[PDB]
Amino acid sequence: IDINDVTPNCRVALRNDSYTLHKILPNKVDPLVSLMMVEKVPDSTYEMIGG
């Protein structure tokens, strides 16, 4: 890993009991907010709306 890769505010994995940074995990996204994102678009369409 590189310091320019571990620029601040990025989740990183640490080896147990030694705490040796060894990966760049994807940026933190809170659970119960990650699922607040439409992954399967509903089936409604503007053609289903009248007036």
* Binding status of residue 17 toward another protein by CB under 8 A: yes
Core vs surface per residue 10-41: b (16+ CB within 10 A) or e: eeeeeeeeeeeeeeeeeeeeeeeeeeeeeeee
* Binding status of residue 26 toward another protein by CB under 8 A: yes
Residue of 35, 41, 48, 49 that binds another protein (CB under 8 A): 35
- Say if residues 35 and 46 touch (Cβ distance below 8 Å): no
Binding-site size for another protein (CB under 8 A) equals 14
- Chain residues binding another protein by CB under 8 A are 11, 13, 15-18, 23, 25-26, 29, 31-32, 34-35
